[PDB]
Amino acid sequence: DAPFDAVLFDLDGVLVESEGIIAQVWQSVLAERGLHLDLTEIAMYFTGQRFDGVLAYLAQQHDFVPPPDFLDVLETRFNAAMTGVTAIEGAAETLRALRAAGVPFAIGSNSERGRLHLKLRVAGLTELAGEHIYDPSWVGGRGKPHPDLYTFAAQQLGILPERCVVIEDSVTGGAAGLAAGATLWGLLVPGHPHPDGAAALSRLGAARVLTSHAELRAALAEAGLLTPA
């Protein structure tokens, strides 16, 4: 029983740390303007929300309406901040191990293509990540949670999606992997925010929920893809 032929990776939260950096920008721009929120609230409610929606939330939940310069300053600073994206601890080692073992893998991200590659670059992962790196523009904009991106990634590796394992930190991305026919392993590295928690990923249908790249490599070894260490 060898369950998998290939690994399909999420980007944000699994290979690179971006949601925490974005949360810090919200927190500082707001704090400067009088409203002091904690990073967990910001990560939970602000990240991956449309700007008008953030304004509605601020008004409804905090009786707060930001000053005119709010949009401009946020943009100026999300831009400057994107350079500060880092690799998730252990991620480079997982990619290096898979490459040494000759296991096919691909990355599937809802990031716009330029940003996807910028993040891999500043995180120091470009060489390790390889060339099977897919954003929604490869599937006509039908990004996660549609299965299309992971179906396509599997196709590009010449492997059936049913024989892939998808490593994801959100319901949005986990759903895309399951809908493609893959097995879902949640990965929630602590110390970094993720869009959903372990209970949600398990209820969604993750076969497991791992909490470190060391645990991921151990699981991949149990599945016959790496050597147990």
Task: Give 12 or 66: the residue with its C-beta nearer to Na ion.
Answer: 12
Q: Has 10 been labeled as part of a binding site?
A: yes
- SS3 for 147? coil
**Is 75 a known ligand-binding residue?**
no
> Least distance (Å) from Na ion to the CB of residue 105?
16
State the Cα–Cα distance between residues 88 and 12, nearest whole angstrom.
9
- Exactly one of 4, 7, 10, 54 binds Na ion (CB under 5 A); which one? 10
The interface with Na ion within residues 160-189 (CB under 5 A) comprises 169-170
Annotation-wise, does 12 bind a ligand? yes
CA distances in angstroms from 212 to 131, 188, 228, listed in the order given:
24, 7, 16
Q: At its nearest, how many Å lie between Na ion and the CB of residue 194?
A: 7
Q: Write down the least CB distance from residue 169 to Na ion, Å.
A: 4
Does residue 13 touch Na ion according to CB under 5 A? yes
Q: Which residues are 153's β-sheet partners?
A: none
User: Closest CB to Na ion among 6 and 14?
Assistant: 14
Ligand-binding site membership of 72 (annotated)? no
Report in angstroms how near the CB of residue 12 gets to Na ion at its nearest: 4
| Residue 170 or 183 having the CB closest to Na ion | 170
Task: Kindly write down the DSSP assignment for every residue of 196-224, as one continuous string.
Answer: S-HHHHHHHT-SEEE-SHHHHHHHHHHTT
Is 10 or 135 the residue whose CB approaches Na ion more closely? 10
Nearest-10 Cα torsion for 37, 62, 111, 71: -100
Q: CA–CA separation, 11 vs 187, rounded Å?
A: 11
Q: How many helices (H) and strands (E) are present in the chain, helices listed first?
A: 11, 8
Rounded-to-integer distance, Cα 46 and Cα 54, Å: 6
Examine residue 135 and tell whether it contacts Na ion (CB under 5 A).
no
Contacts to Na ion by CB under 5 A = 10, 12-13, 169-170
Residue numbers belonging to the annotated binding site for Mg(2+): 10, 12, 168-169
Residue numbers belonging to the annotated binding site: 10, 12, 168-169
